[PDB]
Symmetry: C2
Subunit: 457 residues, 2 copies
Amino acid sequence: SITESFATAIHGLKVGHLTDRVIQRSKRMILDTLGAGFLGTTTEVFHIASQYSKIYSSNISSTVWGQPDIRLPPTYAAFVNGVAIHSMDFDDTWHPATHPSGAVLPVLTALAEALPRSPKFSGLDLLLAFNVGIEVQGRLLHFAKEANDMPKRFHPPSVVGTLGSAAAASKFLGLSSTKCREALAIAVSHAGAPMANAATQTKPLHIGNAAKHGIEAAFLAMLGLQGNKQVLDLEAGFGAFYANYSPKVLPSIASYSWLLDQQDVAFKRFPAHLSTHWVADAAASVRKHLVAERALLPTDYIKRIVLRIPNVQYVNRPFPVSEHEARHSFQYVACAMLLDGGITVPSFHECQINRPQVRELLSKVELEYPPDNLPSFNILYCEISVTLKDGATFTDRSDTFYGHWRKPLSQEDLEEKFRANASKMLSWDTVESLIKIVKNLEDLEDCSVLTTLLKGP
Amino acid sequence: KSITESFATAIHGLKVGHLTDRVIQRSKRMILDTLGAGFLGTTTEVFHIASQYSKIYSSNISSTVWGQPDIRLPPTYAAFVNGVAIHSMDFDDTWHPATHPSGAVLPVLTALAEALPRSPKFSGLDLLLAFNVGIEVQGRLLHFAKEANDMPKRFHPPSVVGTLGSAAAASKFLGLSSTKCREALAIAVSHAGAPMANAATQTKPLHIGNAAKHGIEAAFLAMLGLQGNKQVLDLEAGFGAFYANYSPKVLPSIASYSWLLDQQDVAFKRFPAHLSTHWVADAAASVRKHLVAERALLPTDYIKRIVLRIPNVQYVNRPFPVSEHEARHSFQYVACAMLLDGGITVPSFHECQINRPQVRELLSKVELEYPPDNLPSFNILYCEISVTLKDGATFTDRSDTFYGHWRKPLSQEDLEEKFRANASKMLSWDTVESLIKIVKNLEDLEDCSVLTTLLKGP
Ligand code: NA
Ligand code: NA
Ligand code: NA
Ligand code: NA
Ligand code: NA
Ligand code: NA
């Protein structure tokens, strides 16, 4: 069965199955995700998630990133750190479309701190469990062509991320293939959040809950709870989250091939929906024609701004107000880039989003939907056309952006993003120590060195 | 106003004065039946697993695990474990459109009432109001699709509407503003929705346990200021994601409010199995009496063919169940156990009983037929059974309504006797009788601590 093929691989994959490339790519993902989390601990949604979670205590506990004072049961530590990771839509993005690392990394750091292993949990053990969690998500996404395109009904992290967390937790716990299977079945009953709460303050909890519920499923499987033995094979099981469900068995452990070895992740340079990174790139490029040697946008002289984009309705927001809406707005990212010449973390403060000059530009934006601009991160582009009041029009088309898997961030730029994100809450020495540890994570003998640094300062 | 706003307005705005005599009468029955299901459910392995998992969580506030004075949990986890107990044996109440409404709501309110004592005290009438708001919200959400009138095909309804009913009941207990009631619903939507495949497995009871737990979590997060989509119930890509054909409608105004429970009663089960098998058991019980009257039951080996004419409900089509959970979801096993044993009782679903060779011999003779008029709705469906013997004689019987269905509801006496049988496994007779009396007069109770103190046992 398909379900059995997943359980067999989760249990059976070994450190020796890792490739150099999958280790290199997952180390980049781990660093980027830690940075997103640390920056996320400054957000209101993180404060709410932590205030809720703090009602719970346990003799078996792990720590919230950067917050030595907040010790939580590992399920709730993973919840809060996951909320932080996804709080600003700054975390990594894959193809088919999901945010994979945020569902997996805080699970494994929580469990490593809360539950000593024998032998002790090593950097390679972490990389193995992490890559199993990533791999399971990607294989589940490939169960339907529709997961290649932007989601219409369920938010993918809540669907595949929940099972990825369960798989990573099952790997950490050393569960038998039978108990790995049960963990997946139990996780299915915790999976699946609708798309409506995207672009609201609740969206980050989709990743926090994926992390939390995956651990809960693994724990319950460990204790002996049973679920449907064919849960991934059934239209009324995991297929309930898909419009057209086409599942397939995994490859055999013999000469296993990782999806991450043939599909890199995208890393964001600013905290917003990935589709808007194409918009930002094109708007930055067209701006050169408008400002000449003056460095100033001729705002009053612009007649019309046309964005030729894929039809992605949850990112079509002509007048966003909240930070969450602006992160999901083709239009705001275009106009802020034209006006400001860049997009940064403060671009999504409410006081920037509602600037009168921004709203003047937003009043001039029209969307067009070219038929070949399909709503997939592997296909889509943005073409922007700016028409001036004298009738002159300048056009710029971006089919990728720096940080996309087609143009991946350098190690240097990835580390500089991490430094910017983490220095809000950690000291310089801790930031540099984390860079060095993660860069050489396969050499780390004891993960407690990593989890101790994550407490700060 | 939006559909979502109309729900928040009603949750916040409904008052004890809006309750009718009939909704109080029917909900008092639901509360007693659900307590009994829970008490009996504390004997099950799934409850013990849920309890062992939950015991790792401590909090400064705590509530009781029913019948377990040795176990106190944060109210979220108490509602979780008691909800698992309620649904652990598929013995809890069933509504139209199809769901199990009380299990998602009662353990929420008993947990919160004990963990967060109020002044003025939380009265029986306050409990009845918050309970009936939770029930009402579920019913209105079920009516957002014609398909909820029929058996589910993709998502298990308790996980969908139960989660929001819990959120509503918790929001009512906590006295949240209408705005925060709205946010609680929106947050709850992101916690809702479990697929059907885990029905007939040991995980199904967690659908009700999680509905209870996640509704409280949503209300707590709303109380802390978390915000979600303001039109979550209006949107195809919000709550509509769980429905094939979504057709939401505003609630009526509170100034002229009518409760769904006033025009649609619940069904109470007589044995712990899927409601659709209660028609099968009823029909098989009668055909058995006919066979015995003609001296044609024994030997069981002279039965050649057993035809069940039933609705097309494939997750209850299980010709050779082996586990307890499969047998509770098997037309075939319920028919065969009734024919062999002459009744269906709690031990009928122990695996030793399920896997008796005589049972397997009867199961191998069963065939299902699907009459087109036997629609998969608890309002419509029936069971016809035909037993043919080796000598050719055919005995046919039929059940259009079984005792316990809303059309033929359990008398108060029989409902109380079911409670006694279920609750006496964990409670002393004095406590059992005290709970019957308290619930029967719940509108007169000044302080719900009198009720929650008894729930600890013995
Ligand atoms: Na979807
Ligand atoms: Na499907
Ligand atoms: Na145009
Ligand atoms: Na769900
Ligand atoms: Na729908
Ligand atoms: Na009859």
